[PDB]
Amino acid sequence: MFSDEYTQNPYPIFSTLRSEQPVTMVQTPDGARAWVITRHEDVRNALADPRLSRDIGNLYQALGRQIGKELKPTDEITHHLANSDPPRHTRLRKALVFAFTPKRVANMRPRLEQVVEGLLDELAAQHQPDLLEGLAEPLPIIAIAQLLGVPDSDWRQFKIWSNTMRADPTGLLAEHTRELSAYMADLIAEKERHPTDDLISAMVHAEGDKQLTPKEILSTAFALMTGGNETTTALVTGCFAALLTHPEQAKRLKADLDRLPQVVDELIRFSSPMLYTLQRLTLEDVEIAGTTIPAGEILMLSPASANHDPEALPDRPDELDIDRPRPVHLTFGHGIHYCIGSHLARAQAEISIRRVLERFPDVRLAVHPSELRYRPALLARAPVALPVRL
Ligand code: HEM
Ligand SMILES: CCCCCCCC(=O)O
Hints:
By secondary structure, this protein is of the alpha+beta class. The chain is 50% helix and 7% strand. The chain has helices at 4-8, 11-20, 40-47, 56-67, 88-99, 102-124, 131-136, 139-148, 155-162, 173-193, 199-204, 214-228, 230-244, 247-255, 260-271, 303-307, 342-359; strands at residues 23-27, 33-37, 52-53, 280-282, 286-288, 291-293, 298-301, 364-365, 388-389.
């Protein structure tokens, strides 16, 4: 499956799979088997299915049995909510929801607008401006730094560490995790003494069962960094890619820019910046679309395929149409693990798109759509470059 044609445009393959092979077993780059689930109905149900596990210990045990080696238990910093099942997940999630509120995101928007305006100042000076390099790549970790409460004095080191929290180019996951942990532990202690208007402070001073331990707050911060950096980059890039490859619709959006909050969901659905969700492990035998998948197997659920499924969106699902009724989509997941950062991701996309279209009303792609490229993806997916003419 994982061919170059799939990498660049998976939608024809997803159409074949949804029709002919809605559960298809593949081998992943690590040598383990995975089962790719492509129909919207099955992706949604699987995300709601208590028989599927996100527990990292269970997943590594299954991976180790398939590859024949026992994998060592992972560090407790990895036991955050995205790597947990209930009841552990329920407690960690409840504390995070208490602090990471829609109101907190709304309150971050003034500074986010100011950050975007500064990034566009730098973009306006480039000889060959690129919306990925100049906007979609830098914005997410700036937003996460603001959300957490990282001081500007520590900015450059935080950015360096965050480039590992996705081992990425260096493989320094252990070293950077240790260093970032020591830094974030000191920041958590600083917010205990000197609380400020940020998420770490809100979690440190939470009451009752909403209060996690300092180590759990540290692990939560790691989940937010890994969960919201490359994903948001892909979402912002994908939304711009959708507009820029459909200039007639970009023109209409520019002419009626107040519609933007009611159009972003279609940009997200169409661009589908989440190719797969996090892996799921079967805790017991499960039947999906006529196929029995035994206990102990790994599922790969595709929001991108679900978002383009005509069973869920009968009218031209493989086309972008900003005028269609606001669609529901699976890009943020579904069920108990539904993206905690969805309002913050939306805000970054809305602010970025609005300010680009306002400041650069003639913005257009500098290449033909056929020249865009993607790299192989196991989670988030978007073009590797978005060169524009301003
Ligand atoms: C600053 C922005 C973001 C932050 C802080 C963030 C953080 C998180 C966290 C902590 C979780 C785990 C929730 C849980 O397990 O209960 C999560 C789930 C998820 N996030 Fe986000 N996220 C952000 C943006 C995004 C974006 C832009 C996308 C899509 C392109 C995305 C897609 C998802 C999905 C699909 C899930 C569910 C995963 C699954 O069920 O397998 N997130 N997010
Ligand atoms: C494998 C652990 C991932 C930590 C948070 C990721 C959330 C997401 O799927 O974007």
